[PDB]
Write a protein that binds this ligand. Structure first.
Ligand SMILES: NC(=O)c1ccc[n+]([C@@H]2O[C@H](COP(=O)([O-])OP(=O)(O)OC[C@H]3O[C@@H](n4cnc5c(N)ncnc54)[C@H](O)[C@@H]3O)[C@@H](O)[C@H]2O)c1
Ligand SMILES: NC(=O)c1ccc[n+]([C@@H]2O[C@H](COP(=O)([O-])OP(=O)(O)OC[C@H]3O[C@@H](n4cnc5c(N)ncnc54)[C@H](O)[C@@H]3O)[C@@H](O)[C@H]2O)c1
Ligand SMILES: O=C(O)c1ccc(NS(=O)(=O)c2ccc(Cl)c(Cl)c2)cc1F
Ligand SMILES: O=C(O)c1ccc(NS(=O)(=O)c2ccc(Cl)c(Cl)c2)cc1F
Lengths: 258, 245
């Protein structure tokens, strides 16, 4: 309420400059539904060339048909973004068919809500493999070309779960904290290496009504199109930590004072 | 001094310390041996863990050692069966075992990234899932996660390690909240986050120098007072608060 009217005031008197992403080759994982699908529509309206990845073939082709109706060029690939071998083989395919990815959006995610003793060890493994390990394989495959050209943008889709824990979501919160840490260390390392042209953004939304989980963990709801608008607005202005809603940054700051 | 925290006793508790064969794990073992606890020491380095145990026995403590790969789920479960049969139910778990392979992202080997996660965070899940049930049954336990300042702030050339350390802090925070949500009042949690400790784990600090024994003293003092987030040095909490501004 107090931050909501103060930030809207700061966005007019002190606006951040918007860059263009037209013609960029944007790779979005988990583009077959929810945040990934609606982020794809935002980049299609930005006149980007899209590469969409997902284990759900039907859904990613449905996202691609809608992006093409928006005027964009789109290539889809069925890729398990938690499988290292599949990711590397698919990067070879993208280079051969599309070119060098310039903007990577690591959005694919998985969750198996349960208290620690009711979890399956395979679900814990899959949570890490997709929510953080997969970011490493995809980033390692696409970063060389971005470094060579001094031009890229690594977007990590994490969660408020990457900043604060939640009961019954221990393995998921842990993998989301791992995603925030990967974004922070990546940001610092690129800067230490003198690589000025590669930007980084972390998207941390609260509960989004996508069916990913059933209900919010608190007495809080975000729509998918709002989160995609927040993400694209943050990417175009090179915002490093994007909270949706942005006022959640003060709740997290107050937690570090108790 | 004006507001002191009460110190509990850990005498006779069964304390399991992973990575007890050297550094923080070894000197934490000596602290618990002086506290009159029943120690269970785990490490992939047999020679080093038995060397820690001989020194713990000279301190008056009863000690059991096991050679366990704390990044291997099957090895951890089989070893927990052995600990129950030979020692009993662990009451205090110190998830200290860790690994690091310093390099820029494009110089990391995918196997090193995998091993970093398997030992620094996945192993905490398997060990905690094996030991937490008896703690819940008895409404009495203490889960200690040895993380790092790397679990709060990133560092160049340590991306996979920082990511696994952030995962460890997150596991500690979601565990604390879940135990509380379930009405489990008797199980305490502590997170140890030291800056560079001179143990040989890494060659030099990443920024512009703790001694092993100081970190072990800070850890035991935090456990005995039920401190949830232990920073070594403690003042390195205001540096993290200033970063968020
Ligand atoms: N929905 C929320 O409340 C919420 C909040 C914060 C963050 N997030 C994060 O946002 C991201 C997207 O969530 P969503 O709500 O849009 O989810 P969703 O269920 O709508 O879709 C996620 C997509 O990822 C795909 N995916 C899953 N496993 C995959 C794999 N191995 N390889 C490739 N693709 C895979 C699924 O097929 C699906 O199309 C996730 O990382 C999630 O953790 C979600
Ligand atoms: N040393 C530092 O600067 C520093 C700073 C902050 C946090 N930490 C953390 O403290 C912990 C201990 O670090 P240290 O400096 O005492 O290290 P160390 O190198 O002195 O000893 C770590 C011990 O863990 C054991 N270990 C490694 N892999 C294992 C495995 N798979 N199974 C079982 N044991 C295994 C090693 O054999 C070794 O005895 C680690 O988790 C580390 O990340 C270290
Ligand atoms: O990532 C998810 O799928 C996800 C699930 C549940 C959720 N619960 S919430 O919206 O009530 C909420 C709001 C603020 C905070 Cl600090 C926290 Cl931890 C939680 C938030 C999520 F991001
Ligand atoms: O875990 C390690 O092995 C480890 C390695 C290097 C290190 N560098 S440091 O002590 O200069 C330092 C001081 C303040 C901050 Cl915030 C950070 Cl991230 C780092 C700290 C470590 F914990």
């Amino acid at each position: 309420i107090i931050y909501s009217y103060l930030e809207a005031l700061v966005k007019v008197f002190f606006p951040r400059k918007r860059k263009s992403v037209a013609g960029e080759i944007v790779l979005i994982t988990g583009a077959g539904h929810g945040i990934g699908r609606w982020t794809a529509y935002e980049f299609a309206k930005q006149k980007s060339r899209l590469v969409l990845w997902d284990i759900n073939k039907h859904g990613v082709e449905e996202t691609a048909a809608e992006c093409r109706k928006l005027g964009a060029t789109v290539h889809t690939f069925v890729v398990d973004c938690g499988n290292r071998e599949d990711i590397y083989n698919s990067v070879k395919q993208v280079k051969k068919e599309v070119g060098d990815v310039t903007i990577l959006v690591n959005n694919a995610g998985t969750v198996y809500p349960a208290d620690l003793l009711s979890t399956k060890d395979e679900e814990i493994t899959k949570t890490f493999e997709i929510n953080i390990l997969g970011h490493f394989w995809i980033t390692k495959a696409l970063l060389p070309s971005m470094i060579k050209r001094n031009h890229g943008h690594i977007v990590t889709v994490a969660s408020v779960c990457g900043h604060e824990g939640i009961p019954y979501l221990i393995p998921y919160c842990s993998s989301k904290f791992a995603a925030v840490g990967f974004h922070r260390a990546l940001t610092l390392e690129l800067q230490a290496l003198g690589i000025t042209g590669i930007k980084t953004s972390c998207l941390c939304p609260v509960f989004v009504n996508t069916g990913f989980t059933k209900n919010p963990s608190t007495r809080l709801i975000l729509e998918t199109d709002t989160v995609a608008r927040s993400l694209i607005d943050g990417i175009l202005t090179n915002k490093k930590m994007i909270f949706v809603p942005s006022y959640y940054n003060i709740y997290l700051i107050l937690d570090k004072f108790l």
